[PDB]
Design a protein around this ligand. Structure first.
Ligand SMILES: [Zn+2]
Ligand SMILES: [Zn+2]
Ligand SMILES: [Zn+2]
Lengths: 111, 49, 129, 85, 42, 64, 147, 49
């Protein structure tokens, strides 16, 4: 989540306030500035797992092309779900399956 | 046989099916006769030759 | 999509129109383009609101009227298309449907004839729709 | 498909443990290969840290720019490749 | 009702070729060109 | 490094064509048009994306 | 719409587009501004529909900064008019009005060609960039040309 | 006999799918999981025929 400016709306850039010795978020088209809630400024994940759980929707159970399983839902204990392996398109992606209960829509595995 | 169709080899199978019949194993002999699914897969391999 | 689908199956929308719901990508695409290659299929009843479910919509009564040429108060191929028993699908819509290979595969069965061919087991999904 | 065929000296070639030692010395390992994540903090006090996670680590250890570069190594790949901090 | 047999499937297919034949994609395409497409191009 | 480029633009004053030279100094964001004939000089600011057609356009508007 | 930058090579990994009858590729942000939506915060609101994911935002970071100095509609349209390099001496008073035709017509003409409907092209442009990054983020396979 | 050997080969392919999806499959040197998975299934089916 990146933050811009509520007036100018330009993407605010992080800049240090040397005199008070605190981190600010400054604009570049006007004089607006505000205090930083997070010392972290940037993160780079080399060994990443983001996106695998990204593809979750409410109508996946209406797709008749998906295979159906008997797995017990932890929430409602229904005997009717669709399942699918990971939608992550990496070459090293695992083949472990995700099951989606058609009632509460929770995602679990067989581990 | 590759997943030409989104996550399946033919529209007569469900998605994410890696079983023998799904990815081109022709169980029958030429004497017995091939099923329609097997037939197309055999024609794909034959075309490549 | 159910409403739109029913308009094509009655004739209100031209039968060659494609109605494609891609659920995963959250996209709904409709094509009235010229030049799409399509083929006809039997419609199977999929709505769990009737005893009809799991069977072919087409019955011997339609087959009876086809051989006569007239209804019992011209009746040919296109009469079937605008009465909801056959529809056209193109390559894009074909991606989202589940097709049985023969009418006999719509219902589970009760062999060991060493001459005849083996039918596939189909045991990866417990119940097909 | 460029490929080398690397025969080993006889005394080493009949002892699988010594051959594994040769294996790890030849194989190229970069820092990128073992790094799981990198981070950039604003840590203005050089003797402390806003990060509660590295509190007990840096406080006991200690007993310039305010920007901090914090990189995390993956334990599994570091253990397999036999590399120490 | 009853089940659709193999012979019944060929009755349906017979109705298709009775109405459309084998070259209707050639003829209908050209017919649409004379009726409408020429006019629109003008 | 500076870029010294010849162009096929017509000088707005002496009217000699193919005699305007453009010197683009990106280190200081300063572009320079020069004639080779009457040698009139015109300076204008340039970015990193600019090309001889960008400052020659600014020269047409600076006259009118 | 081409995504430059190779794996750990190409430095700034920005995105430029190609327009009919214009010489060299123009960065995406510039054409967004040139259509009447200059506000950055609005630009990102047209492309990415998930503010939560950093990755679908870190890759658009260099595109903002390489098109930051173009801060309004008029200087945006002007730059496009200079890219074409047709009839040297078009001027700003009119070189804008020539580029407004290259944006209204030709560029995505299947959506519409009447005036005062630039909201559809801006929304569509954001969709394209979204699809481009999904493939670059390995969240979707590249399309199969033989489908 | 012929039908049995093909039936038992389809079962072993099921076991391989189970193992690979429950993280119980041995990784072959130089190969990712999906390569190793695809490799083992191919070897089984050609030996079955
Ligand atoms: Zn501002
Ligand atoms: Zn549930
Ligand atoms: Zn001059």
């Amino acid at each position: 989540s990146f933050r811009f400016c509520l007036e100018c709306n330009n993407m605010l850039y992080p800049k240090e306030d040397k005199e008070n010795q605190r981190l600010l978020y400054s604009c570049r088209n006007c004089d607006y500035t505000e205090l930083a809630e997070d010392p972290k400024v940037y993160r780079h994940e080399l060994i990443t797992n983001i996106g695998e759980t990204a593809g979750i929707v409410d109508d996946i159970g209406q797709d008749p092309t998906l295979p159906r399983s008997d797995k017990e839902c932890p929430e409602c204990h229904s005997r009717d779900c669709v399942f699918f392996q990971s939608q992550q398109r990496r070459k090293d992606t695992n083949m472990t399956l995700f099951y989606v209960c058609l009632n509460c829509k929770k995602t679990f595995r067989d581990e | 046989i590759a997943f030409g169709f989104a996550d399946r080899s033919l529209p007569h199978f469900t998605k994410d099916d890696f079983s023998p019949e799904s990815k081109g194993f022709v169980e029958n002999s030429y004497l017995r006769g091939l099923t329609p699914q097997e037939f197309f897969f055999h024609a794909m391999a034959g075309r490549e030759g | 999509v159910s409403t739109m689908r029913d308009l094509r199956r009655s004739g209100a929308i031209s039968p060659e129109v494609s109605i494609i719901r891609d659920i995963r990508e959250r996209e709904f695409k409709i094509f009235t383009d010229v030049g799409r290659v399509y083929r006809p299929l039997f419609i199977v009843e999929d709505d769990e609101s009737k005893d009809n479910k799991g069977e072919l919509r087409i019955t011997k009564e339609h087959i009876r009227k086809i051989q006569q040429g007239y209804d019992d108060d011209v009746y040919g191929w296109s009469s079937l298309v605008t009465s909801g028993v056959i529809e056209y699908v193109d390559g894009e819509e074909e991606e989202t449907i589940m097709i049985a290979m023969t009418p006999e595969d719509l219902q589970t069965r009760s062999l060991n004839d060493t001459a005849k061919r083996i039918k596939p087991e189909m045991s990866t999904s417990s119940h097909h729709t | 498909t460029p490929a080398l065929t690397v025969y080993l000296d006889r005394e080493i070639a009949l002892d699988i443990e010594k051959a594994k030692v040769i294996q790890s010395s030849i194989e190229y390992t970069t820092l990128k290969n073992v790094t799981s994540a990198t981070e950039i903090y604003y840590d203005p006090d050089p003797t402390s840290t806003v990060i509660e996670e590295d509190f007990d680590t840096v406080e006991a250890y200690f007993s310039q720019s305010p920007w901090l570069l914090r990189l995390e190594l993956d334990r599994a790949r570091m253990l397999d490749k036999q590399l120490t901090m | 009702d009853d089940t659709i047999t193999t012979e019944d499937c060929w009755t349906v297919i017979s109705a298709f070729f009775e109405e459309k034949g084998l070259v209707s994609q050639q003829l209908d395409s050209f017919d649409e060109f004379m009726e409408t497409s020429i006019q629109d191009l003008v | 490094i500076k870029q010294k480029l010849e162009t096929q633009f017509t000088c707005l004053f002496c009217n000699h064509d193919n005699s305007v030279v453009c010197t683009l100094d990106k280190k200081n964001s300063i572009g320079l048009l020069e004639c080779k004939k009457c040698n009139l000089s015109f300076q204008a600011p340039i970015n990193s994306l600019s090309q001889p057609i960008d400052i020659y356009s600014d020269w047409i508007d600076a006259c009118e | 719409i081409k995504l430059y930058g190779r794996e750990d090579k190409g430095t700034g990994r920005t995105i430029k587009a190609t327009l009919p009858y214009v010489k060299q590729d123009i960065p995406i942000v510039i054409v967004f501004r040139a259509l009447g939506v200059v506000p950055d915060g609005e630009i990102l609101q047209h492309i990415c529909y998930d503010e939560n994911d950093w990755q679908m935002l870190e890759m658009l970071k260099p595109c903002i900064e390489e098109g930051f100095v173009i801060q309004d509609k008029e200087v945006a349209l002007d730059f496009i008019g200079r890219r074409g390099s047709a009839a040297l001496g078009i001027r700003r008073e009119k070189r804008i009005q020539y580029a407004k035709d290259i944006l209204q017509k030709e560029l995505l003409p299947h959506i519409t060609q009447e005036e005062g409907f630039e909201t559809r092209k801006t929304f569509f442009l954001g969709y394209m960039v979204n699809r481009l990054l999904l493939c670059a983020l390995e969240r979707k396979d590249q399309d199969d040309r033989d489908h | 006999e012929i039908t049995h050997a093909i039936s038992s080969a389809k079962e072993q392919v099921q076991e391989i799918i189970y193992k690979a999806q429950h993280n119980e499959l041995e990784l072959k040197p130089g190969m990712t999981l999906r390569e190793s998975f695809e490799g083992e299934v191919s070897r089984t089916l050609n030996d079955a025929r």
